[PDB]
Design a protein around this ligand. Structure first.
Ligand code: DQX
Length: 273
């Protein structure tokens, strides 16, 4: 990881919170190409001091995204570990998380937009699968919109997948249960069951999000009822825009070995026209 000096980073507005983290917009003063000075917008993720013990895992997640380079993976600029703070310095994606964007723009997003975003996410996951790299936290909040659809010039939307944050393999059980139904059943049974099939399940849940205008599946269920939801082997209801319901249910297979490869998922996606 490239170590960035605290002097070169300026914290600005809070954008929200992750698990044991606070997230801010910031500015990084840097020497760019040809020696030109730039003040670059950045995303600053800060681990809560009270959870400093997760630091390793906190950085491990980010490490996963920087091992490979891909057009659909958010860039990591480096880390600031100056002092007692642990800071991730990442690319600032203009339009932010996809779930917020869907909730705000639901009244003007059709099937073609959803299908393009789904294809891009599936392509990112196919890249990860071919590299045998587990993401571990696919969800609409971790999809970021680089640019919007422009029907005037035919441009499709473009998305990037963000880093997964602290791994579910080390998170407390109640956080895992709160993350049903993104966390697959076998990881609720044993968090060390984290596997490639995990991301296929979570991809199904994320498709449900994309199709549901930013609604959160099973949000009306508390943790005990989410557990019970997995115990009775229920599936998510089809979204009112049901064009992807079969794909969602095929990915959210209670048998991890039966979840389809992302190549087959991409084939299915392309078959809808
Ligand atoms: F606060 C968060 C930040 C990210 C995130 C991770 C990695 C890179 C990111 N780049 C930009 C933005 C971002 C945030 N807002 N905006 C603009 C859009 C509208 N104008 C203001 C800025 C851009 N967010 C990024 C992911 C999250 F998961 C949350 C946590 N939450 C996710 C759901 O929404 C609330 C925050």
């Amino acid at each position: 990881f490239h170590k960035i000096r605290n002097e070169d980073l300026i914290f600005n507005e809070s954008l929200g919170q992750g698990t044991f983290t606070k997230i801010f917009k910031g500015v990084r003063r840097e020497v760019g190409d040809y020696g030109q000075l730039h003040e670059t917008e950045v995303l600053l993720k800060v681990l809560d001091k009270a959870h400093r013990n997760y630091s390793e895992s906190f950085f491990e997640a980010a490490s996963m995204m920087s091992k490979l380079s891909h057009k659909h993976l958010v860039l990591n600029y480096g880390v600031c570990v100056c002092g007692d703070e642990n800071i991730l310095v990442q690319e600032f994606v203009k339009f932010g998380s996809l779930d917020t964007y869907l909730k705000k723009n639901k009244n003007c997003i059709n099937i073609l937009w959803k299908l393009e975003v789904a294809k891009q996410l599936a392509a990112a996951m196919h890249f990860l699968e071919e590299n045998t790299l587990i993401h571990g936290n696919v969800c609409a909040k971790n999809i970021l919109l680089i640019r919007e659809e422009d029907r005037k010039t035919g441009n499709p939307p473009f998305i990037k997948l963000s880093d997964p944050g602290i791994s579910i393999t080390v998170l407390p059980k109640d956080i895992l249960q709160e993350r049903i139904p993104w966390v697959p059943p076998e990881c609720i049974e044993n968090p060390k069951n984290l596997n490639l099939a995990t991301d296929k399940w979570s991809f199904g849940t994320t498709l449900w999000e994309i199709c549901s205008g930013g609604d959160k599946p099973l949000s009306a269920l508390d943790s005990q009822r989410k557990l019970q939801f997995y115990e009775d082997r229920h599936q998510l209801p089809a979204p009112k825009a049901a064009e992807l319901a079969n794909l969602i249910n095929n990915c959210m297979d209670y048998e991890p070995d039966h979840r389809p490869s992302f190549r087959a998922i991409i084939r299915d996606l392309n078959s809808l026209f």
